[PDB]
Short mmCIF file of C-alpha atoms and ligand atoms in Angstrom, two decimals:
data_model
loop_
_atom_site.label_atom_id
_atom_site.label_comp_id
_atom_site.label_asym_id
_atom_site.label_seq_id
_atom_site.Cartn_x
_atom_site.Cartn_y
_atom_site.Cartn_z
CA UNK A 150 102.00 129.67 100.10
CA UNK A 151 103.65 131.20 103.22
CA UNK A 152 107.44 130.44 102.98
CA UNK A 153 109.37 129.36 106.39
CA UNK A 154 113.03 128.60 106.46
CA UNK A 155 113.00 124.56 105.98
CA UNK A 156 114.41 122.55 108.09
CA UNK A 157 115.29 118.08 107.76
CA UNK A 158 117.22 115.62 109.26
CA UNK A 159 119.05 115.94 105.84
CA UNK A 160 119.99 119.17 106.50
CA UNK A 161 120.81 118.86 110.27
CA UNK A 162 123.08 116.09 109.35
CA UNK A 163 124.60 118.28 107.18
CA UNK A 164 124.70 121.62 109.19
CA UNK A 165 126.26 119.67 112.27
CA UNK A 166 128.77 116.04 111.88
CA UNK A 167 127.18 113.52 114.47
CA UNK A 168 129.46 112.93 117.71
CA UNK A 169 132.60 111.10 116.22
CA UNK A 170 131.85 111.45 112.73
CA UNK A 171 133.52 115.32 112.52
CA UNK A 172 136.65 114.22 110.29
CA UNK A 173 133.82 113.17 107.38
CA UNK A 174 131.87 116.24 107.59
CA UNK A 175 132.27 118.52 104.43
CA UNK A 176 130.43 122.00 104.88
CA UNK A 177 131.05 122.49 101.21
CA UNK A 178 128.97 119.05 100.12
CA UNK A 179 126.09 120.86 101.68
CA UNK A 180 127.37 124.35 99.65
CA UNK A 181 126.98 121.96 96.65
CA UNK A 182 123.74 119.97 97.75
CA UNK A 183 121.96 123.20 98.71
CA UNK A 184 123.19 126.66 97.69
CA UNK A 185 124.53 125.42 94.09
CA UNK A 186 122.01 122.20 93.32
CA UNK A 187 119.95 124.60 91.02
CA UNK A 188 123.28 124.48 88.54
CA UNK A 189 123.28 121.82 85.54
CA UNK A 190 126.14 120.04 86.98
CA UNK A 191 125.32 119.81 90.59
CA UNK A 192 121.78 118.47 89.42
CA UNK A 193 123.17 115.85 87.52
CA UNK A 194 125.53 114.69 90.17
CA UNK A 195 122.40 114.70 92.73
CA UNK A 196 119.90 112.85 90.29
CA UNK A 197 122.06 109.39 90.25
CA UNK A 198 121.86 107.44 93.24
CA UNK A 199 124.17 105.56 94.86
CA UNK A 200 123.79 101.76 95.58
CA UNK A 201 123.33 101.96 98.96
CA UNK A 202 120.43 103.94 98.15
CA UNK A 203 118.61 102.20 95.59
CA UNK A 204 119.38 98.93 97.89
CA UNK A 205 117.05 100.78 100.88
CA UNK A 206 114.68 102.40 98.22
CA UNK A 207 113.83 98.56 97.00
CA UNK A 208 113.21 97.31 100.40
CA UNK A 209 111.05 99.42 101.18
CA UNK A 210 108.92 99.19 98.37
CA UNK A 211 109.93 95.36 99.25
CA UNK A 212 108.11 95.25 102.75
CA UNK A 213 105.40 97.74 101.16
CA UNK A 214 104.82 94.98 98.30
CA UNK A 215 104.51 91.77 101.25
CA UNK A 216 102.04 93.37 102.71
CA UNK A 217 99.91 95.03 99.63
CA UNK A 218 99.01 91.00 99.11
CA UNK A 219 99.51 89.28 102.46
CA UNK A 220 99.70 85.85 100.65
CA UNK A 221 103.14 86.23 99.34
CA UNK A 222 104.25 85.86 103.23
CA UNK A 223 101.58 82.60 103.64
CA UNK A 224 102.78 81.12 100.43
CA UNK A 225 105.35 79.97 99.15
CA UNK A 226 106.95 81.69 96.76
CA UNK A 227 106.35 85.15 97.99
CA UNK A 228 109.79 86.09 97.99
CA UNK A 229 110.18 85.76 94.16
CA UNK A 230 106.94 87.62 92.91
CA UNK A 231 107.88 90.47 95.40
CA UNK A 232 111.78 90.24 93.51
CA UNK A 233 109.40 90.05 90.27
CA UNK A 234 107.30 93.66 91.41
CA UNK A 235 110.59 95.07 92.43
CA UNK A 236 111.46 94.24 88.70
CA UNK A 237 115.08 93.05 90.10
CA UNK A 238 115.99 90.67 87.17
CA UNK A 239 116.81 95.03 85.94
CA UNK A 240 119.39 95.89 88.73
CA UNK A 241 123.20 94.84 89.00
CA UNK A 242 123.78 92.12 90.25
CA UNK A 243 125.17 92.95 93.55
CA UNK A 244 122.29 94.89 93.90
CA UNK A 245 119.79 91.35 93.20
CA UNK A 246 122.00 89.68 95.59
CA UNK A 247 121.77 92.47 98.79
CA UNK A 248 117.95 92.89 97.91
CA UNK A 249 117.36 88.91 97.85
CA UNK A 250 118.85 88.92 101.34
CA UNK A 251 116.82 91.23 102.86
CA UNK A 252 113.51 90.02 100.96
CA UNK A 253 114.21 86.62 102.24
CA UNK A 254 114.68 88.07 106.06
CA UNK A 255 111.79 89.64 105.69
CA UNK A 256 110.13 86.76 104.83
CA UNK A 257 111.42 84.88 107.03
CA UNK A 258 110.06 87.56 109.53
CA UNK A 259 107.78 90.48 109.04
CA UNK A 260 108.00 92.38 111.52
CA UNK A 261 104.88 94.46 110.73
CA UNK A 262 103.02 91.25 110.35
CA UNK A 263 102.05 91.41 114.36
CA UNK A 264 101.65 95.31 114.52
CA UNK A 265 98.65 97.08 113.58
CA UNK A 266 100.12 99.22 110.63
CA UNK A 267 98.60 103.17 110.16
CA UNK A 268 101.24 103.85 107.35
CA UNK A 269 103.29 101.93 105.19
CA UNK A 270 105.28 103.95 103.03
CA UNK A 271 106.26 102.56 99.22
CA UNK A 272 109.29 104.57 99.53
CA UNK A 273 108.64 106.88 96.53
CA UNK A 274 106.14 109.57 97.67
CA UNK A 275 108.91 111.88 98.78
CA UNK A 276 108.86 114.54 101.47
CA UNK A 277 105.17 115.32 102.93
CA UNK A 278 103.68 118.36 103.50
CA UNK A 279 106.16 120.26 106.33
CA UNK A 280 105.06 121.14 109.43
CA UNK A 281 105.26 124.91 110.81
CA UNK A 282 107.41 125.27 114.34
CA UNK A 283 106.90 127.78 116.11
CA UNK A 284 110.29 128.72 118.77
CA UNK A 285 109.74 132.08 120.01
CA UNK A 286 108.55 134.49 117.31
CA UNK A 287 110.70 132.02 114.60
CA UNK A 288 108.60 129.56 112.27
CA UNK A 289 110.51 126.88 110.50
CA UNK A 290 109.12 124.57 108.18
CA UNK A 291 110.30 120.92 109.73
CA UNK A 292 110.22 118.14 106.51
CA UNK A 293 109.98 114.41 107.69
CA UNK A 294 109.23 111.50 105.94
CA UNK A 295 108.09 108.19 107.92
CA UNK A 296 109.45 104.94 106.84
CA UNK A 297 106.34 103.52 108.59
CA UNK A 298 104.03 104.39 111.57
CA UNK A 299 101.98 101.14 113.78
CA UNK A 300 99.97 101.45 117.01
CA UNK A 301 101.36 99.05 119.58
CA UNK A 302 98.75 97.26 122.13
CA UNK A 303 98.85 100.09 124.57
CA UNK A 304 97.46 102.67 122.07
CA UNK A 305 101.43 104.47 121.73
CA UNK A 306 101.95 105.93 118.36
CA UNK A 307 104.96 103.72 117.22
CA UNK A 308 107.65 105.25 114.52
CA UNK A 309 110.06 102.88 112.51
CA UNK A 310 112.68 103.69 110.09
CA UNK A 311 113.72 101.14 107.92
CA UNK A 312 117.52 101.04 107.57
CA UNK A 313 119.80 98.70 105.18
CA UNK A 314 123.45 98.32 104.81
CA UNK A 315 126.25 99.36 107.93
CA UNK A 316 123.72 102.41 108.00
CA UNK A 317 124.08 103.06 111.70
CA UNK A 318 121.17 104.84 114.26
CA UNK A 319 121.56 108.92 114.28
CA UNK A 320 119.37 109.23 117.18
CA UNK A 321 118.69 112.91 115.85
CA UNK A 322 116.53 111.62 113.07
CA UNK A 323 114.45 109.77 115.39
CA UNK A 324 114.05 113.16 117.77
CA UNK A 325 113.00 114.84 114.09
CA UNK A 326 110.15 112.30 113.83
CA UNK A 327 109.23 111.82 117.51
CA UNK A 328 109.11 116.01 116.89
CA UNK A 329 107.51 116.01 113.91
CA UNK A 330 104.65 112.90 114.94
CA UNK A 331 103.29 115.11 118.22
CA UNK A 332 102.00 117.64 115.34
CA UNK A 333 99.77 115.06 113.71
CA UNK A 334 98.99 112.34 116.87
CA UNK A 335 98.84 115.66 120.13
CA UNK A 336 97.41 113.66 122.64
CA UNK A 337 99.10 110.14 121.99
CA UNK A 338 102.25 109.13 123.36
CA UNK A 339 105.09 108.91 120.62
CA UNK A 340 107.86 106.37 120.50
CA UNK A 341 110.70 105.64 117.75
CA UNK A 342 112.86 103.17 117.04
CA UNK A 343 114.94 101.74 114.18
CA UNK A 344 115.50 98.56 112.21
CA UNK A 345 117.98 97.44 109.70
CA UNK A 346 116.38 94.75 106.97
CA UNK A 347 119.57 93.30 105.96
CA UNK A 348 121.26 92.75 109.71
CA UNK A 349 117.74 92.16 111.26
CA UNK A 350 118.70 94.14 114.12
CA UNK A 351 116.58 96.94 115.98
CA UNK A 352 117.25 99.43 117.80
CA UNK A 353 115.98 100.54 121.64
CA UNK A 354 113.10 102.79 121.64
CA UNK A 355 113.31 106.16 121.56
CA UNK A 356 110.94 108.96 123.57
CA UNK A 357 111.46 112.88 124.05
CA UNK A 358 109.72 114.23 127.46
CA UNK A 359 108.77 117.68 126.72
CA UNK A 360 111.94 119.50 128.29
CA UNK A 361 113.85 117.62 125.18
CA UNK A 362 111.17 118.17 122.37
CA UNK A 363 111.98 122.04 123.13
CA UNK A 364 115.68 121.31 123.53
CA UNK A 365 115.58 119.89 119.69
CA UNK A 366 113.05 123.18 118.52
CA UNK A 367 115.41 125.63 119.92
CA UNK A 368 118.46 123.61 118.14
CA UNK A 369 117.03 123.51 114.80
CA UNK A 370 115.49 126.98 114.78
CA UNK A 371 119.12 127.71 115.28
CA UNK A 372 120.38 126.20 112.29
CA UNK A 373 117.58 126.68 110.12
CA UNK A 374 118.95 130.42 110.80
CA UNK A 375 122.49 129.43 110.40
CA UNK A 376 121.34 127.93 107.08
CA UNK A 377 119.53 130.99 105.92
CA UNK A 378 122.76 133.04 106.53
CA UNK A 379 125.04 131.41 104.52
CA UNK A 380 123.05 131.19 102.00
CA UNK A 381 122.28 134.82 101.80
CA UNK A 382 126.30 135.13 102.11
CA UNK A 383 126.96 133.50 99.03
CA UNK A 384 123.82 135.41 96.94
CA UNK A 385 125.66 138.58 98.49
CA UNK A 386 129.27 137.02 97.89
CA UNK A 387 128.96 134.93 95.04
CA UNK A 388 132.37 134.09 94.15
CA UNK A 389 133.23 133.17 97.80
CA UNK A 390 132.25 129.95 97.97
CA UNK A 391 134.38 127.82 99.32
CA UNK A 392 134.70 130.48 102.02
CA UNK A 393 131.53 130.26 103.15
CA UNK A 394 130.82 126.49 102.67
CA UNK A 395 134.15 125.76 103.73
CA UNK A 396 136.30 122.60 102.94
CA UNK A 397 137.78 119.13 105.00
CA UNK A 398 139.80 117.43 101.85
CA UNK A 399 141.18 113.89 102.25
CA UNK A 400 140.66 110.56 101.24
CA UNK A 401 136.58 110.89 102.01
CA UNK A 402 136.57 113.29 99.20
CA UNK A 403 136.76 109.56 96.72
CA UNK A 404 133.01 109.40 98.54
CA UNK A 405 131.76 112.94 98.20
CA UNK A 406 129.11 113.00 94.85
CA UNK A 407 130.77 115.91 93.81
CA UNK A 408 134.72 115.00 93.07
CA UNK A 409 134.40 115.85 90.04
CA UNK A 410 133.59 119.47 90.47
CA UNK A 411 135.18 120.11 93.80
CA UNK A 412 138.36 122.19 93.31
CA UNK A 413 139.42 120.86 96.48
CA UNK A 414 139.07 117.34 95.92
CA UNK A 415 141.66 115.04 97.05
CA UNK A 416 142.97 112.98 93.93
CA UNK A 417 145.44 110.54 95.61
S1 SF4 B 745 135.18 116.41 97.14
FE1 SF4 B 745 135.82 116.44 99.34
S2 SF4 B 745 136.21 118.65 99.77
FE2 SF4 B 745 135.00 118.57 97.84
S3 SF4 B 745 132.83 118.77 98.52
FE3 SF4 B 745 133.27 116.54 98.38
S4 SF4 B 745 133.91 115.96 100.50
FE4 SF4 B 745 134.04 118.24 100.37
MG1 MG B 746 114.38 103.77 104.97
#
């Protein structure tokens, strides 16, 4: 069990804001998510999920289910036993009516049906096993979990993310994957794209020459480091905290998971 500092698109996304997201980027949400998740509170806060989660969580285990038995896309109700597996008579209903949606445009076309599929994820294994990177004399331990992996025709190694909601592309989590799949598939070229199941839109695909795969090492050693450091900051400074993981208040603190606790939350 050799520990490396870890490293995720979770955490990159909250280490750096994407391009023209900076005004909704709270350096203490990641204080709370990592640094302070290990207190009864925090843990609580971070064990409910939001809708927009669960919605995503279903379909997957949604396009997982259609093609466990490939009948319930050649028959015709498949639709309603695959709502019956996802046991969604139990959600809200909001949450029935979203899922139905994107069960029925799935249905109405698979998208994996004409791809030959390596990996179909259910959506509830969690993180795999990370991946050591090795930039200079650092190691980092890189955590990525693949929505779903086909070959296409001309033997390319083909990564999709399955997306739901306004959810828009960060192209960073595909340069995590397209990173993270030339550890397991060396000599195969890599591609990634995206696709949202409730707009039935996809995105462009998405390759890394090698000049860029290093590019994106030597980036996320960096914060993996940066990570590290404030963390040891706060075990050396512990009542500093909202120094180190400093705070942007404002009306995206009615969003943040941890409003109740924040002592900088914005109440208007
Ligand atoms: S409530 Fe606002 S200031 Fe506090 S952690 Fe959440 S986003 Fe940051
Ligand atoms: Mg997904």
């Amino acid at each position: 069990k050799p520990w490396y500092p870890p490293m995720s698109y979770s955490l990159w996304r909250s280490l750096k804001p994407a391009i023209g997201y900076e005004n909704w980027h709270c350096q203490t949400k990641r204080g709370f998510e990592k640094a302070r998740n290990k207190e009864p509170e925090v843990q609580r806060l971070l064990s409910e999920d939001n809708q927009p989660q669960k919605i995503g969580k279903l379909a997957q285990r949604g396009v997982f289910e259609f093609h466990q038995e490939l009948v319930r896309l050649s028959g015709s109700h498949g639709v309603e036993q695959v709502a019956e597996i996802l046991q969604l008579n139990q959600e809200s209903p909001e949450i029935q009516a979203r899922v139905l949606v994107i069960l029925n445009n799935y249905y109405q076309q698979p998208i994996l049906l004409n791809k030959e599929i390596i990996n179909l994820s259910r959506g509830d294994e969690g993180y795999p096993e990370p991946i050591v990177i090795e930039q200079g004399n650092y190691k980092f331990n890189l955590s990525a979990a693949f929505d779903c992996i086909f070959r296409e025709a001309d033997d390319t190694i083909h990564i999709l993310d399955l997306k739901t909601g306004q959810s828009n592309f960060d192209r960073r989590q595909a340069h995590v994957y397209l990173l993270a799949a030339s550890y397991r598939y060396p000599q195969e070229k890599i591609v990634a794209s995206f696709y949202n199941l409730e707009t039935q839109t996809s995105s462009e695909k998405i390759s890394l020459s090698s000049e860029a795969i290093e590019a994106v090492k030597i980036e996320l050693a960096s914060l993996a480091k940066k990570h590290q450091q404030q963390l040891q900051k706060y075990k050396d400074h512990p009542k500093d905290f909202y120094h180190i993981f400093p705070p942007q208040s404002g009306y995206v603190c009615r969003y943040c998971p941890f409003t109740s606790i924040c002592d900088y939350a914005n109440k208007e």
